[PDB]
Amino acid sequence: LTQPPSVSVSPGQTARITCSGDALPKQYAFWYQQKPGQAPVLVIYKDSERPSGIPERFSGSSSGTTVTLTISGVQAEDEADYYCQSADSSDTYVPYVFGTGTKV
Amino acid sequence: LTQPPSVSVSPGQTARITCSGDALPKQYAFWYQQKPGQAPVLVIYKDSERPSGIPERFSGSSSGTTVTLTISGVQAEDEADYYCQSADSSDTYVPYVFGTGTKVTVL
Amino acid sequence: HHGCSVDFSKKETRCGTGVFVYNDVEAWRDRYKYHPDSPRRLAAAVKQAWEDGICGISSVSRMENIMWRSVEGELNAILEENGVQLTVVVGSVKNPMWRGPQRLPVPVNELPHGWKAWGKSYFVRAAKTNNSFVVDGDTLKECPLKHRAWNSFLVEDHGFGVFHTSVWLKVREDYSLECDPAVIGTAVKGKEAVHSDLGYWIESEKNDTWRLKRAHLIEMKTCEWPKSHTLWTDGIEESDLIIPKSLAGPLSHHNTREGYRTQMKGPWHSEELEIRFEECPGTKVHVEETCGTRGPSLRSTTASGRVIEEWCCRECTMPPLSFRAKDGCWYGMEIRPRKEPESNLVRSMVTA
Amino acid sequence: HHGCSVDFSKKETRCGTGVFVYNDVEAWRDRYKYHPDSPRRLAAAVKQAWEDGICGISSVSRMENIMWRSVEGELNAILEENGVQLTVVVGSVKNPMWRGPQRLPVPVNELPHGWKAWGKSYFVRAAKTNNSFVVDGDTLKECPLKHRAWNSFLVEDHGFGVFHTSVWLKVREDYSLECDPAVIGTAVKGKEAVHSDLGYWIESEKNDTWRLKRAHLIEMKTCEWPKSHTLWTDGIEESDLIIPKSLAGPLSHHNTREGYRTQMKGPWHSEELEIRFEECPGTKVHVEETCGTRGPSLRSTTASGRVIEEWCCRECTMPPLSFRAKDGCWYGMEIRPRKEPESNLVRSMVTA
Amino acid sequence: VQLVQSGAEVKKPGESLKISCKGSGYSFTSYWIGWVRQMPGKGLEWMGIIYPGDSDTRYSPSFQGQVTMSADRSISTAYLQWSSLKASDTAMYYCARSNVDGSTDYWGQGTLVTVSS
Amino acid sequence: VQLVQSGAEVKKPGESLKISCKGSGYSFTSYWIGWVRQMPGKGLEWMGIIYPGDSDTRYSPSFQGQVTMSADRSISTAYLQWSSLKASDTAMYYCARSNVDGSTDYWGQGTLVTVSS
């Protein structure tokens, strides 16, 4: 639900992005990267795993009611927006909800 | 127990000495080598095994009521008298019997 | 050992001598009356453990918890005739029963006051103190799981038997991770096997290979099943055992079913489970490659009572794997809903 | 399965449901009406095996020999009626029961003439014939062990334990070296275990480690004990098993005694054995270093009847291993006489 | 796998509009289809999901009634319909393939809708 | 481990004789002691065994009465005594150590006995 509106680092450093929500302990979380001009791309799924085709410098972790996305070896090709997706149970509505964003 | 009186072989091949007895299926057999001028030496015990300090060309085997001792490669120092010892059960006498003796010559 | 038996399928009655393993799990009751070594040797060992930085006790099984509850009153009657400021407080158990790092010590000498022979007719009820020695309860804040003794009792050599009412226990001198062998019974006869103890009853059969048939657990232990009491322990992959090894599952070829791996994320929070191979009431399962992958176990009814009727799996065999707890029916780790989003289902929140 | 166990010195009965394993070795030879698959189907299988070069049968156990003796008379009725010239001749068994390389074939057509339902009331004795199908006897010259079928039958459903119960046999389609698992019962409970079948009864206890306690054998089989019916099968050296694996000994840590190795040269020619750990009447054993090494097992009495009184061994543990047959005491392979020469004793002439 | 959307649309307020999202390469009726909005220079929002085969729709509370989602399992196409476009409907619309566990696998190239006057 | 015999003897018929075989290096009272004869240019023949401690003697039938085998536990010495030497007593006499399983392990050097007038 909540994200930090902007972070800024220098090449070679390691940046950490924070997603916070109440239902996170009992629900999965996914992270999406969106470079300007294109469609979102899935980078992290089920709070820790990586799809095949993503550089091994992308990782995430879950600690209670917070999930963090960390970018270890930051190059130049990482200036995008990162979005957090989680869920909350329902019966007649769509369960999913997006985070606010982070302009790295 | 009965043995061949003599065995003659040139250096290099094998020599086979047989010892025949009726109670050999039920008893152990042993082989002794005695060179002229010395005391006998155990060579093959329990008709299959070899004591320490004996060359690996010495081996034996048994087949029913006969037992044989074989020397793989005859050497000039392997000519002597060879005796087989076996036993027969008793209660008051000595159980052990010696064979007759096989004179091996390395030509 | 003598006895007579009746078989109700191949109608037959027989008598003779032999070895008999009984089902004490179904209809478990107050069949046994448990006591520790001596009333003054347990008080001395509890006093010493408090002065060595041990806070409380984590219980291995339900049996030890019931034993602690019965002895608690008499234990506090002693420890005041010696002036000790210490009170034993016994609570209830929650599944799973997690391990503990410490063990209870063996006192060099007993406390020099009191009585022998557990079960004095009348004693004055002791008064509360400031210091508490908590036995497993909801007390993980006053002292955490890292200061708690676990698995420090052993059943005595003749302390157990078929015609026994009282079981004699004793503080062990060694350190172990194994489940107590005095109360384990394993047997196979023909095409049926069992691995059993005071809280487990695990059955097997022979169809084309040996597989799990059904299990009935009334506790979730975390000790290790000894290999002397296990059938067919060799050539076993630890990742094929339905009941995980960390939950006192036997390391046996009997603990397997074709198409299923270890259920580390089953509903091990329940007070009682039954592991069955069939569909739950109202739901059906299909096998297809469009299904998802393994995750935590899911209940077949939502938190509001609605029943999800279609499920799938990738490479599992029929009938499916189910857990039957008192709150409901739950599916195996491999079986996922076909149409309903998983965020709308109740999921298991524990891991072995 | 319900059953109930009784304690005579207490007038008390405890019971419930479970798995019961019975001692069927101390008393056997009841009346069973055997049912090899079919009279016209066993006739076809025996006939076809004679044309494929199989001469006779090497029996696997005493159960199969008894079954062949009951069926023999009716089996020759059915063959001199379809016009086959063949006679079945059943003889006694000798220990050990060595393996054969062949197996009986599953027939194709089930010969036309004859009757179903094993056990007709009155038929006519069949005339003798030149050809002779030989079931295990002293007939190793008629046709040798290399031309003999072995382990061709599987038990399908038995009413063992009670007399006058039919047990159904069937000719197997595959080839196997293991003992039939339909009649095997294994059970451990606390500190005592048993491995058993229709001819073996092998006990274990826990002193400081699990070890052998005693064994009673009313036959010497040569099949392989299946690992599904065995406790503690991993980390086992085959040279530490007291009963050799080639004599249908279980591959278990329960088959071990400390200080002793496998007894391949025990007196396995006896008709019935009992394996005790106890000195024999009138003899003493001392642990020394001047003693000999292992050899064939020796009887404690010479061929006259004189008792040898002093024995030794190198690295044993007391009490010593012994065998008790009708002839008398034999000692373990590691235990040799201390003064009397070994050529004056009776030694065993078989090996496994 | 592939999802193909329609072209950019330039519309006036007050009329209807259908945008489509055709999919191919997989079992179209075994997966959900989600609709995501992205206003110019803003973040992502969920407009709900539809399950083809049996056109089960689960809207978002801030979108029900104001938009209609529909599916046509014969041609493997999922639609999205307005009745009277307003000036606040200028955005980019993405169709996506949602799984039962919740991950969004494939995204369409997007349809840019502009409402002006 | 060694057995040491006594020296060679030359004697006239009708006298007596006693030859010894002193064992050392091992326990003398845990093994049998054998005596073996070998006439000049002939094979070996057993003379029977004696067990020191339980001083049991088991003669060969060809030698009983003719020769007397004795022992001496304390000094670890075995003996072989004649009462009246005959001309046919010229031979070689070996003492040896016999195991219970029947293998003769160690031998002494031997003792010449020459009988003449």
From TrEMBL, chains C, D:
Subcellular location(s) per record: Host cytoplasm, Host perinuclear region; Host endoplasmic reticulum membrane; Host nucleus; Secreted
Domain of life according to the entry: Viruses
Subunit structure: Forms a heterodimer with NS2B. Interacts with NS4B. Interacts with unphosphorylated RNA-directed RNA polymerase NS5; this interaction stimulates RNA-directed RNA polymerase NS5 guanylyltransferase activity. Interacts with non-structural protein 2A. Interacts with host SHFL; this interaction promotes NS3 degradation via a lysosome-dependent pathway. Interacts with host CEP63; this interaction disorganizes the centrosome and inhibits host innate immune response.
Cited function: Prevents premature fusion activity of envelope proteins in trans-Golgi by binding to envelope protein E at pH 6.0. After virion release in extracellular space, gets dissociated from E dimers. Plays a role in the inhibition of host RLR-induced interferon-beta activation by targeting TANK-binding kinase 1/TBK1. In addition, recruits the host deubiquitinase USP8 to cleave 'Lys-11'-linked polyubiquitin chains from caspase-1/CASP1 thus inhibiting its proteasomal degradation. In turn, stabilized CASP1 promotes cleavage of cGAS, which inhibits its ability to recognize mitochondrial DNA release and initiate type I interferon signaling.
Name of protein: Genome polyprotein
